Design a protein around this motif. Structure first.
Motif, PDB file in Angstrom:
ATOM      1  N   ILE A 186       0.847  -1.080  -0.091  1.00 42.07           N
ATOM      2  CA  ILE A 186      -0.106   0.164   0.130  1.00 42.07           C
ATOM      3  C   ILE A 186       0.987   1.190  -0.083  1.00 42.07           C
ATOM      4  CG2 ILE A 186      -2.092  -0.917   1.132  1.00 42.07           C
ATOM      5  CD1 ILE A 186      -0.829  -0.023   3.685  1.00 42.07           C
ATOM      6  N   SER A 187       0.353   2.344  -0.302  1.00 41.15           N
ATOM      7  CA  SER A 187       0.945   3.714  -0.471  1.00 41.15           C
ATOM      8  C   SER A 187       0.042   4.874   0.031  1.00 41.15           C
ATOM      9  CB  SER A 187       1.712   3.939  -1.770  1.00 41.15           C
ATOM     10  OG  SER A 187       0.687   4.368  -2.596  1.00 41.15           O
ATOM     11  N   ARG A 188       0.734   5.619   0.950  1.00 42.49           N
ATOM     12  CA  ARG A 188      -0.320   6.578   1.605  1.00 42.49           C
ATOM     13  C   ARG A 188      -0.934   7.484   0.315  1.00 42.49           C
ATOM     14  NH1 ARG A 188      -0.640   7.405   6.991  1.00 42.49           N
ATOM     15  NH2 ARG A 188       1.383   6.360   7.371  1.00 42.49           N
ATOM     16  N   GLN A 189      -1.987   8.347   0.692  1.00 39.66           N
ATOM     17  CA  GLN A 189      -2.328   9.176   0.174  1.00 39.66           C
ATOM     18  C   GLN A 189      -2.316  10.756   0.894  1.00 39.66           C
ATOM     19  OE1 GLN A 189      -6.592   8.319  -0.297  1.00 39.66           O
ATOM     20  NE2 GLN A 189      -6.621   7.024  -1.980  1.00 39.66           N
ATOM     21  N   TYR A 190      -0.854  11.118   0.422  1.00 41.04           N
ATOM     22  CA  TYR A 190      -0.653  12.299   1.087  1.00 41.04           C
ATOM     23  C   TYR A 190      -1.269  13.941   0.752  1.00 41.04           C
ATOM     24  CZ  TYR A 190       1.599  12.982  -3.720  1.00 41.04           C
ATOM     25  OH  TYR A 190       1.817  13.109  -4.713  1.00 41.04           O
ATOM     26  N   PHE A 191      -1.965  13.664  -0.222  1.00 38.79           N
ATOM     27  CA  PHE A 191      -2.914  14.952  -0.460  1.00 38.79           C
ATOM     28  C   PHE A 191      -3.098  15.744   0.341  1.00 38.79           C
ATOM     29  CE2 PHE A 191      -5.353  17.282  -3.728  1.00 38.79           C
ATOM     30  CZ  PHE A 191      -6.292  17.796  -3.089  1.00 38.79           C
ATOM     31  N   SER A 192      -4.254  15.390   1.393  1.00 37.73           N
ATOM     32  CA  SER A 192      -4.709  16.219   2.426  1.00 37.73           C
ATOM     33  C   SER A 192      -3.836  16.826   3.481  1.00 37.73           C
ATOM     34  CB  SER A 192      -5.942  15.296   3.242  1.00 37.73           C
ATOM     35  OG  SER A 192      -5.434  13.991   3.298  1.00 37.73           O
ATOM     36  N   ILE A 194      -1.089  18.288   2.610  1.00 37.84           N
ATOM     37  CA  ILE A 194      -0.607  19.494   2.048  1.00 37.84           C
ATOM     38  C   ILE A 194      -1.620  20.864   2.406  1.00 37.84           C
ATOM     39  CG2 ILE A 194      -0.181  20.663  -0.317  1.00 37.84           C
ATOM     40  CD1 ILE A 194       0.711  17.773  -1.100  1.00 37.84           C
ATOM     41  N   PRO A 195      -2.916  20.788   2.095  1.00 41.16           N
ATOM     42  CA  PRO A 195      -3.802  21.954   2.599  1.00 41.16           C
ATOM     43  C   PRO A 195      -4.190  21.954   3.979  1.00 41.16           C
ATOM     44  CG  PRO A 195      -5.234  20.556   1.543  1.00 41.16           C
ATOM     45  CD  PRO A 195      -3.800  19.805   1.348  1.00 41.16           C
ATOM     46  N   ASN A 196      -3.947  20.973   4.755  1.00 44.86           N
ATOM     47  CA  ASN A 196      -4.180  20.853   6.197  1.00 44.86           C
ATOM     48  C   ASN A 196      -3.196  21.054   7.188  1.00 44.86           C
ATOM     49  OD1 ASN A 196      -7.438  20.303   5.703  1.00 44.86           O
ATOM     50  ND2 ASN A 196      -6.338  17.946   5.406  1.00 44.86           N
ATOM     51  N   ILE A 197      -1.913  20.515   6.954  1.00 48.62           N
ATOM     52  CA  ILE A 197      -0.777  20.642   7.700  1.00 48.62           C
ATOM     53  C   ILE A 197       0.383  21.509   6.973  1.00 48.62           C
ATOM     54  CG2 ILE A 197       0.964  19.167   9.199  1.00 48.62           C
ATOM     55  CD1 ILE A 197      -1.926  17.653   8.999  1.00 48.62           C
ATOM     56  N   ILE A 198       0.997  20.793   5.933  1.00 51.12           N
ATOM     57  CA  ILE A 198       2.112  21.665   5.319  1.00 51.12           C
ATOM     58  C   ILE A 198       2.025  22.808   5.190  1.00 51.12           C
ATOM     59  CG2 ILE A 198       3.902  21.478   3.589  1.00 51.12           C
ATOM     60  CD1 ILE A 198       2.637  18.190   3.701  1.00 51.12           C
ATOM     61  N   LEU A 199       1.077  23.493   4.092  1.00 57.23           N
ATOM     62  CA  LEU A 199       0.807  24.683   3.734  1.00 57.23           C
ATOM     63  C   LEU A 199       0.230  25.554   5.052  1.00 57.23           C
ATOM     64  CD1 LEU A 199      -0.470  24.524   0.110  1.00 57.23           C
ATOM     65  CD2 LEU A 199       1.940  24.909   1.019  1.00 57.23           C
ATOM     66  N   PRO A 200      -0.790  25.518   5.917  1.00 63.13           N
ATOM     67  CA  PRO A 200      -0.856  26.309   7.014  1.00 63.13           C
ATOM     68  C   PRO A 200       0.632  26.577   7.869  1.00 63.13           C
ATOM     69  CG  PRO A 200      -2.728  24.796   6.871  1.00 63.13           C
ATOM     70  CD  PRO A 200      -1.478  24.354   5.858  1.00 63.13           C
ATOM     71  N   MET A 201       1.330  25.358   8.078  1.00 63.24           N
ATOM     72  CA  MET A 201       2.643  25.543   9.013  1.00 63.24           C
ATOM     73  C   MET A 201       3.442  26.371   8.109  1.00 63.24           C
ATOM     74  SD  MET A 201       4.972  22.394  10.225  1.00 63.24           S
ATOM     75  CE  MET A 201       3.532  21.624  10.814  1.00 63.24           C
ATOM     76  N   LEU A 202       3.846  26.498   6.611  1.00 67.03           N
ATOM     77  CA  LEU A 202       4.658  27.285   6.022  1.00 67.03           C
ATOM     78  C   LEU A 202       4.141  28.687   6.100  1.00 67.03           C
ATOM     79  CD1 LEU A 202       5.402  25.205   3.030  1.00 67.03           C
ATOM     80  CD2 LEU A 202       6.960  25.804   4.997  1.00 67.03           C
ATOM     81  N   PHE A 203       2.703  28.940   5.930  1.00 64.62           N
ATOM     82  CA  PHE A 203       2.150  30.439   6.192  1.00 64.62           C
ATOM     83  C   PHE A 203       2.480  30.993   7.492  1.00 64.62           C
ATOM     84  CE2 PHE A 203      -1.524  28.803   3.149  1.00 64.62           C
ATOM     85  CZ  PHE A 203      -0.834  29.250   2.108  1.00 64.62           C
ATOM     86  N   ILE A 204       2.314  30.410   8.521  1.00 69.03           N
ATOM     87  CA  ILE A 204       2.604  30.946   9.713  1.00 69.03           C
ATOM     88  C   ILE A 204       4.286  30.906  10.103  1.00 69.03           C
ATOM     89  CG2 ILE A 204       0.819  30.440  11.189  1.00 69.03           C
ATOM     90  CD1 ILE A 204       2.712  27.956  12.547  1.00 69.03           C
ATOM     91  N   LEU A 205       5.241  30.368   9.405  1.00 71.87           N
ATOM     92  CA  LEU A 205       6.504  30.752   9.326  1.00 71.87           C
ATOM     93  C   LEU A 205       6.754  31.854   8.322  1.00 71.87           C
ATOM     94  CD1 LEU A 205       9.809  29.769   9.869  1.00 71.87           C
ATOM     95  CD2 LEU A 205       9.230  28.470   7.844  1.00 71.87           C
ATOM     96  N   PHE A 206       6.055  32.184   7.436  1.00 68.88           N
ATOM     97  CA  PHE A 206       6.527  33.334   6.495  1.00 68.88           C
ATOM     98  C   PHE A 206       6.001  34.395   7.231  1.00 68.88           C
ATOM     99  CE2 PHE A 206       6.205  30.056   2.521  1.00 68.88           C
ATOM    100  CZ  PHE A 206       7.533  29.529   3.087  1.00 68.88           C
ATOM    101  N   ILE A 207       4.786  34.469   7.937  1.00 68.84           N
ATOM    102  CA  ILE A 207       4.139  35.595   8.698  1.00 68.84           C
ATOM    103  C   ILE A 207       5.177  36.064   9.717  1.00 68.84           C
ATOM    104  CG2 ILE A 207       2.489  35.768  10.553  1.00 68.84           C
ATOM    105  CD1 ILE A 207       0.498  34.478   8.443  1.00 68.84           C
ATOM    106  N   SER A 208       6.042  35.152  10.439  1.00 65.75           N
ATOM    107  CA  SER A 208       7.113  35.262  11.427  1.00 65.75           C
ATOM    108  C   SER A 208       8.312  36.264  10.762  1.00 65.75           C
ATOM    109  CB  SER A 208       7.593  34.271  12.121  1.00 65.75           C
ATOM    110  OG  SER A 208       8.700  33.553  11.557  1.00 65.75           O
ATOM    111  N   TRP A 209       8.758  35.968   9.365  1.00 68.75           N
ATOM    112  CA  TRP A 209       9.533  36.832   8.855  1.00 68.75           C
ATOM    113  C   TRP A 209       9.300  38.186   8.502  1.00 68.75           C
ATOM    114  CZ3 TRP A 209      11.140  32.049   5.097  1.00 68.75           C
ATOM    115  CH2 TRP A 209      11.699  30.944   5.681  1.00 68.75           C
TER     116      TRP A 209
END
Ligand SMILES: CCCCCCCCCCCC(=O)OC[C@H](COP(=O)(O)OCC[N+](C)(C)C)OC(=O)CCCCCCCCCCC
Ligand SMILES: CCCCCCCCCCCC(=O)OC[C@H](COP(=O)(O)OCC[N+](C)(C)C)OC(=O)CCCCCCCCCCC
Ligand SMILES: CCCCCCCCCCCC(=O)OC[C@H](COP(=O)(O)OCC[N+](C)(C)C)OC(=O)CCCCCCCCCCC
Ligand SMILES: CCCCCCCCCCCC(=O)OC[C@H](COP(=O)(O)OCC[N+](C)(C)C)OC(=O)CCCCCCCCCCC
Ligand SMILES: CCCCCCCCCCCC(=O)OC[C@H](COP(=O)(O)OCC[N+](C)(C)C)OC(=O)CCCCCCCCCCC
Ligand SMILES: CCCCCCCCCCCC(=O)OC[C@H](COP(=O)(O)OCC[N+](C)(C)C)OC(=O)CCCCCCCCCCC
Ligand SMILES: CCCCCCCCCCCC(=O)OC[C@H](COP(=O)(O)OCC[N+](C)(C)C)OC(=O)CCCCCCCCCCC
Ligand SMILES: CCCCCCCCCCCC(=O)OC[C@H](COP(=O)(O)OCC[N+](C)(C)C)OC(=O)CCCCCCCCCCC
Ligand SMILES: CCCCCCCCCCCC(=O)OC[C@H](COP(=O)(O)OCC[N+](C)(C)C)OC(=O)CCCCCCCCCCC
Ligand SMILES: CCCCCCCCCCCC(=O)OC[C@H](COP(=O)(O)OCC[N+](C)(C)C)OC(=O)CCCCCCCCCCC
Ligand SMILES: [Cl-]
Ligand SMILES: [Cl-]
Ligand SMILES: [Cl-]
Ligand SMILES: [Cl-]
Ligand SMILES: [Cl-]
Ligand SMILES: [Cl-]
Ligand SMILES: [Cl-]
Ligand code: NA
Ligand code: NA
Ligand code: NA
Ligand code: NA
Ligand code: NA
Ligand code: NA
Lengths: 311, 311, 311, 311, 311
Positions: A186-192, A194-209
């Motif tokens: 089997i192989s994980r469906q990594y899709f969700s 991206i919009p639920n954890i990865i991108l919100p996490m990068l946005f908050i980091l860029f806001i700190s900069w």
């Protein structure tokens, strides 16, 4: 009942097959999945042979109680499988064809190193214990190995269901054991992720900069500490969907590294203020200008190096 | 016991009928539901035929043990159904009329694309395995399909309970299988999502836009970052009531898009301050005045385009 | 065994009774409760009649296997009840007196409109299916209906346990069914909601109104946004202890309405600042002075109107 | 059946052996673990002796029902073990060789003092109750005590699986009991605690100390109170994965001590401001300069003393 | 089988005894605990009497099926106990000595008034129903009442395990019932509540009082509102480990009262600012100086009064 007697000194070959009806509940923390399937067994019992001319019938049906059936078990199960016999059929030569429908909770470990971009090989081990009268060896009948088209594991892509055709034959408490390895790839469906954890996490980091374009110590302290707390919330959320691994995972590495970025942003914010107060705004200015380029550049190279180590 | 022998070369037709007593526990994350219903089976066994004049009785009752009963199973169940026989009645011609009351955990996938405004078709597959002596075909007796008017699925509207009358006849491990599709059509009660998630989420977003009527960098930073954190809390809350889908959901799309609005509000707040400090309050003023109109307008059009793609 | 034959054309009356020993696990989300009680059944079987002079015995005890017993079931249960026969006694005339102790998970819907000041009527439906030889009708023997003095439902006040003595007699799959309605009337212990949810929620709201006695935009923004986030925490906490209703609840209405107060406090705080900056502190002063009276007054009237609609 | 009669006045020796197949679900909160193993029993029953010329077999097989089997139980289990007999073999002397595969939830206390750097000895107690006719004593056959090479407890390192060969023989309700101690020695995989709890917790603490390089009361209050709240989140997270101990744990001690550091940072921040306002910035300066060295030094010595007391 | 017949008009005395082996899982919210014990029953059945000279044997063993055994049940259990018969022994006079090992989830309410400094009496009720031929009365054999020294209830101190020797004899559905009260006296291990809840909660409160040594409205608003939100987090945490009580608990009282302190700190902070702005810093100074003494003093007296009412 006793087991089938041999012609010479050959072991009894029990031909096996697994056909998946329903596959469900992959629990990452528990490292367990549930299965609903067909188990088919086939062996020759010469004592059950008959003449189709004299008996009229081309096949005879038996209740499990009436004839000898091999004690087949799963190795990596939590509890004994819930099984229900479907059919037992005997051919003229005495070839028995058993079929049961079972359900079991399989315990197979997972490799979270590349999570949430990981692939797995879930294991299902079939085993038989030899008796004193005869040694029993397992075999794979590939025509009776497979899965339903509707079989779906939520949040996963089912690649294949195959069997390692050569059994592992070994001694255990001075008796022979025949183990077989069925593999669900089997192989994980990594899709969700991206919009639920990865991108919100990068946005908050860029806001700190954005603190690198402000001279306001009070505002900077709010920007970096607020976003740091939101990063703690994502780290806590992520670690709740995974077990405690004695190794580093991909998401784990990224989440950890981002703390260093927040820590160094706080030192920058502090240094900038200290200097402004010491009446050195020019030196503070150089450090802030450098941080604007340094922070995204060091973040991009660090991430490239991490992806390289993990993939 | 053996199955009923044929007159010619015809298959045995087992007439079926599921009547829902209780429908409960629709777990969105697991994509399962629980059912409690009557299962009625009917077939002709010429061996059981009798003369009502000679025997006196107009109907004979049998214990399951006494006569041949077809092994009927559900396909998409977690474990085997908990069943209890209610009645078995035989008519003069030998027509058997079986009835049992069962309970099972059904596994049927859900389509979360339009969530929480989604509708589903829950599937219940009935199946029979043909024996070597005779082929068994399932049939739908529409007079015995239905549900109790009291049947209630919490947080859902039950639309219909019907059966796809033509069975799917196919080979499985060199024997015929006769599958039947019973369908429970339901539609989500989206009501509570409005005062508990949708409206609180819009209020916090509109609160962030009050930064477009403020020159106070420190206050603006508090307004936009605080509300962003409350938006993270709603996103975490929403994703806890749903499974990880390899596609975007309606609420998912809106929740994600709103991050972009917060991110752009932070850039606006930053740009406005930078300019004020650079002694360019006039330019900062134009950008802020434009943002007052741009932000609600781009939010309204974006939402129109999203509703259009999803509905 | 066969059912008792009639004298004329009368149905068989099975006298019922339920005596609760333990009531527990009232899940508001699941709308279920668990029960442990005595089920007593009584009917006349003339075939079992005896002469007390000739037999010596005044009563005869039978094992369930030995005599005919009616198939009695609960309608609104998740699974079939766990039952254990306590006693079966036969009187000279043939009156059987059955008694079992059972445990079941009852599924009965709840009305959350007045929550946490709600009262419920939990339903327990007993049913019997008529056989082809005789029609079976249920009856309530009130002397055998009741509850233990120790019976305690955690967080609830048990008001009464009674039975609707007239059965609902109806056709279902061309056979007669006789349903009986046992009712457990309970009322919620709203006490803890006052110091744990209601009063903390009002305190944070009143803290937001201290912004009406401050000219400090930065402090005001902190007061109203902080308290708004604590209100989101209470809303999330409250909605976790309840299912998704297609209607508004009392606490739900109050919780929702309070968001409007926070939203309007933000507009007031914004307007006041804008004016101070525009060098109009006098106009800003009038609006702030009005808000000091308007906010508590509009909150009190709104709450009076809400309590009126709900009670 | 009755127990085997003695030759003289000797007790019956039942030889035991546990072979772990699967070890899973070690719950720290409940202090339980789940096991799937082989239980092997062996004793002499001369009443089962046979001549192979007469019998035509060298080893006899019996169903549990047919012969006398000792009632063997686990002491520290939640419920009775789920067992399934694999084989029963009688040799011409009368040596019965029993084997079953079981699964049980073992209840064993854990020592959290050194957590997450703790090691445990999980206990599995076997017991037999003497009958009035004969006294039964347990024994360990070391050749039948082991574990599978794949046995993996998630988040733990399995060190050994051994038996305390001398049984505890004692009186209980005026009858002899023979207890055996099987020991599973495990050690926690502390790895993940470092990047997920320990290092994030130290980073937030060091961020609070940046207040010692700032004269801004408003910024300092934000730094120390924000980080204090993130420390409360870690404390709540940590205490959720552990039970309530009547003693202090290593992580518990560190987590607690860190509150004192935050409390003293608030006093420093307060004192510094008070002095600046009182027009005493010189005195405030000395205290701040001292805090820069004092805080990390007192933190390092405190941690050295703590590690010393616990290890 | 029938019950033992009477000599006079005397009831049958069934002597009971419970010996705890495992006591675990005290779940405060559910007000349940799970037990694993020995249940021993003893009664005289003259029909089973024998002469030890003629029969040779000094004791006879019987299978439960062979002889009459009283139907003994637990009152306050969730479901019927999982029991397994260990031994049945008959003495010459006909004294039967029964022994079984059982496991049950007991439902006994807990008194949270003094929580987490509470003590409980967990009650276990044994009951017997009299038959029409003879009345059955329960008795306590004190020599067979007790517990294993290793018996441990996590987070609790086991004080005693005794029995109320005089049964509660009463009528229930026109038959006699004999109830017995077995009591397990336990006291909570309050230790961990001190470093995890009580002390962190007092620290945040004392941090709020540093506002009485600050003239900075903006900083004060942050101090009091931040700490208030951390107090809400502790209140939510505490109420999750307890059920909803129709009375006030000790921790509950303290937690509630502390809200009043936060509310009054906000009024003080507001009044101080209003006055400073109104150019009345002298009056504001008096109120702040008084608050420094008033707040800790009123907190100490309030807590003394509360401890007095509760202990
Ligand atoms: C020129 C300053 C460099 C700062 C380097 C800080 C090293 C921190 C190492 C942590 C290791 C884990 C202990 C954390 C204190 C924060 C540092 C504050 C720096 C203030 C700078 C003042 C401007 C002269
Ligand atoms: C912070 C920044 C996070 C960046 C995430 C990188 C993801 C990555 O690197 O993903 C890696 C996977 C690779 O899949 P693989 O089959 O294991 O490749 C095995 C290759 N071998 C056999 C050569 C070793 O690529 C994907 O699924 C592509 C989708 C990534 C989307 C990320 C969007 C943001
Ligand atoms: C005129 C300035 C335009 C700025 C646009 C920023 C684009 C960021 C895109 C991120 C992509 C993901 C990296 C985030 C840094 C934030 C940008 C701060 C802007 C400050 C403006 C200064 C006033 C001249
Ligand atoms: C941020 C803004 C969020 C706006 C939400 C829009 C909801 C929507 O668009 O809802 C869509 C559903 C439609 O139901 P349907 O049966 O699937 O229509 C299928 C139509 N076909 C067959 C043509 C494709 O309308 C409703 O239930 C109406 C109630 C909406 C209330 C929203 C209040 C806010
Ligand atoms: C005179 C001020 C009137 C403001 C009315 C605000 C209506 C908002 C309606 C929301 C509907 C849902 C969109 C939210 C923007 C917030 C409004 C900011 C007002 C600034 C006032 C400036 C002082 C003259
Ligand atoms: C924000 C403000 C929240 C105010 C709460 C109002 C409660 C209320 O209105 O409570 C309503 C219940 C009524 O109980 P009832 O039996 O359903 O009355 C049915 C009446 N009929 C038959 C006429 C329709 O009164 C109580 O239990 C009294 C205790 C209330 C304590 C609240 C303290 C704050
Ligand atoms: C010189 C100042 C020493 C202050 C020591 C305070 C110790 C508090 C001990 C708490 C025991 C638990 C009660 C908490 C009040 C906080 C103290 C504020 C101090 C302000 C200093 C003013 C500058 C002269
Ligand atoms: C805040 C600061 C936290 C510091 C943590 C100290 C850990 C410690 O002290 O760890 C202790 C354990 C010791 O293992 P032991 O077998 O029980 O030693 C028993 C010794 N006797 C027999 C002499 C008593 O060392 C480790 O596992 C080493 C890894 C530690 C990594 C910490 C990284 C940060
Ligand atoms: C001297 C003023 C005393 C303030 C007393 C406040 C009583 C609040 C009672 C709440 C009952 C529940 C409603 C909450 C408003 C907060 C009060 C703000 C006071 C501002 C003081 C201005 C300086 C003269
Ligand atoms: C905020 C301040 C919270 C203070 C907590 C007070 C605790 C208390 O009062 O604890 C009460 C218990 C009493 O135990 P008891 O057996 O029920 O006494 C029954 C007495 N009769 C029979 C006379 C009624 O004392 C303890 O366990 C002592 C340890 C307390 C440690 C608290 C540290 C802080
Ligand atoms: Cl198995
Ligand atoms: Cl099924
Ligand atoms: Cl039922
Ligand atoms: Cl056991
Ligand atoms: Cl019981
Ligand atoms: Cl009485
Ligand atoms: Cl009586
Ligand atoms: Na067999
Ligand atoms: Na049959
Ligand atoms: Na702030
Ligand atoms: Na019966
Ligand atoms: Na036996
Ligand atoms: Na009996």
């Amino acid at each position: 009942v006793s087991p089938p007697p041999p012609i010479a000194d050959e072991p009894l070959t029990v031909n096996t097959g697994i056909y998946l009806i329903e596959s469900y509940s992959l629990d990452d923390k528990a490292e367990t999945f549930k299965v609903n399937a067909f188990l088919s067994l086939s062996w020759k019992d010469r004592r059950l042979a008959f003449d189709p001319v004299r008996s009229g019938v081309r096949v005879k049906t038996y209740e499990p109680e009436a004839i000898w059936i091999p004690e087949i078990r799963f190795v990596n199960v939590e509890n004994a499988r819930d099984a229900d016999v479907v059919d037992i059929s005997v051919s003229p030569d005495g070839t028995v064809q058993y079929l049961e429908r079972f359900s079991a909770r399989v315990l197979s470990p997972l490799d979270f190193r590349r999570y949430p971009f990981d692939s797995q090989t879930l294991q299902i081990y079939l085993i038989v214990r030899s008796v004193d009268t005869r040694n029993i060896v397992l075999a794979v009948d590939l025509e009776k190995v497979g899965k339903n088209d509707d079989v779906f594991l939520t949040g996963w892509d089912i690649e294949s269901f195959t069997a390692v055709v050569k059994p592992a034959n070994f001694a255990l408490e001075d008796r022979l054991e025949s183990k077989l390895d069925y593999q669900l790839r089997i192989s994980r469906q990594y899709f969700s992720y991206i919009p639920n954890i990865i991108l919100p996490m990068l946005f908050i980091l860029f806001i700190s900069w954005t603190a690198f374009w402000s001279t306001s110590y009070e505002a900077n302290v709010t920007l970096v500490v607020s976003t740091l707390i939101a990063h703690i919330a994502f780290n806590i959320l992520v670690e709740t969907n995974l077990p405690k691994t004695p190794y580093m995972t991909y998401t784990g590495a990224i989440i950890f590294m981002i703390y260093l970025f927040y820590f160094v942003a706080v030192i920058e914010v502090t240094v900038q203020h200290y200097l402004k107060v010491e009446s050195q705004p020019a030196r503070a200015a150089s450090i802030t200008r450098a941080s604007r380029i340094a922070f995204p550049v060091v973040f991009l190279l660090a991430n490239i190096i991490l992806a390289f180590l993990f993939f």
